[PDB]
Amino acid sequence: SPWFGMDIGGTLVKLSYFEPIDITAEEEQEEVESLKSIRKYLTSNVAYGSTGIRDVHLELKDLTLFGRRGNLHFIRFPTQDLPTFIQMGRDTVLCATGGGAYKFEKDFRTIGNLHLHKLDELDCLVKGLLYIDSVSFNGQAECYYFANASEPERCQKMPFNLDDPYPLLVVNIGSGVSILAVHSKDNYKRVTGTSLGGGTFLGLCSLLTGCESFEEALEMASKGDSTQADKLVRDIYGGDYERFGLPGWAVASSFGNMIYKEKRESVSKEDLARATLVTITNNIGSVARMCAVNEKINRVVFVGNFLRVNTLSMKLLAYALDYWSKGQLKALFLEHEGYFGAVGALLGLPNF
């Protein structure tokens, strides 16, 4: 039985797979050929079919888990392609979390030699996050922040120690956004959420620009100028709004310049991609700041796949939390951003 953990989200399926590297001579001999073919297929390919990807750079090597030494692998594919994954599975104890553990429960049970154990999406997140940080990223910090995020000639990624990680605000940016207040390893609550998340960025961007991938959307946004679409404080006041400490550059109305036909006619797709990214990211940052203030928590860690290969949004979040909180809040990030639920699921395996 291969050791998997699976997080089936609204958009992406994340899979953590533990590859034993201490396979003895007797164990190799007693290996069922199908179990051998799984391990060979998973470790000898980095693309699976047309849409599966192994994130090789995230691999944890020589991890000790459940008393065995092995490597922890991190794999993702679109939830839309889960029927393909299940069909190829019909050609094992599976701990599964995310909404799709419930939605596709019956489909997983079409695999006769499969027991499905559903685990809560956010309990797995907490356990996975705390575990990965505890074992480290192959000796490097799992957690990092952007030092001096207000000055760009100085803004740089630096490691951050989470050895006493409580209390902690966790902002899970997936399709939507869940915000968790973690007070201890067994004491956490979902403070709130927002539906303006990664799927809003991707959905709106596709409507506005015709982009066909998340990566293409980010590439368009990198070339854009969001102030072509956004109305700024200085467009309304002619400068700063000093009475309430609002700088001229702050966005007063997202997409607010698009009420004018002549501006809609001159804006570029790249501008609109960037305005979509900026709008969604700042709104998440502002919501996170308000929850942190209300929960009295000054460490805010952002996870979920909206931030993978998305340094723009990370820097936007780093700068915004630091600026608007006058340095009282810190935006934290984690290398294994999208995978903590899948890892937490895998960690539930002993209970079964």
Ligand X SMILES: Nc1ncnc2c1ncn2[C@@H]1O[C@H](COP(=O)(O)OP(=O)(O)NP(=O)(O)O)[C@@H](O)[C@H]1O
Give catalytic residues, as residue numbers. 121
In angstroms, the CA 160 to CA 286 distance is: 22
Which residues does residue 299 pair with via DSSP β-bridges, in sequence order? 330
- Residues with Cβ within 8 Å of 190's Cβ and at least 6 positions away in sequence, in order, are 122, 178, 179, 180
Amino acid at 335: E
CA angle 160, 162, 167 (to 5 degrees): 125
Tell whether residue 128 is a contact of ligand X (CB under 6 A).
no
Smaller CB separation from Mg ion, 148 or 192: 192
Interface residues for a copy of itself in 67-96 (CB under 8 A)?
80
Nearest to 77, CA basis, from 251, 349, 285, 338: 338
Q: Is 286 marked as binding a ligand?
A: no
In the bound complex, what is the minimum distance in angstroms from residue 84's beta carbon to a copy of itself? 16
Tell whether residue 264 is a contact of a copy of itself (CB under 8 A).
yes
Q: Check: CB of residue 231 under 8 Å from CB of residue 252.
A: yes
- Residues with Cβ within 8 Å of 52's Cβ and at least 6 positions away in sequence, in order, are 75, 76, 77, 81, 85
Interface residues for ligand UOS in 211-270 (CB under 6 A)?
233, 236, 241, 246, 250, 252
| Alpha carbon 36 to chain centroid, angstroms | 31
Contact track, Mg ion, 140-179, x by CB under 5 A: ----------------------------------x-----
In angstroms, the CA 313 to CA 309 distance is: 10
* Helix (H) or strand (E) segment spanning residue 169: strand 168-173
Smaller CB separation from a copy of itself, 68 or 234: 234
Contact track, ligand X, 11-50, x by CB under 6 A: xx--------------------------------------
Contact track, ligand X, 146-185, x by CB under 6 A: ----------------------------xxx---------
Interface residues for Cl ion in 94-123 (CB under 5 A)?
117-118
- Give the residues lining the site for a copy of itself (CB under 8 A): 9-11, 80, 98-100, 102-103, 120, 122, 175-176, 190, 192-200, 202-204, 206-208, 212, 229-231, 233, 235-239, 241, 243-244, 246, 250-261, 264, 272, 279, 282-283, 286-287, 290-291, 293-294
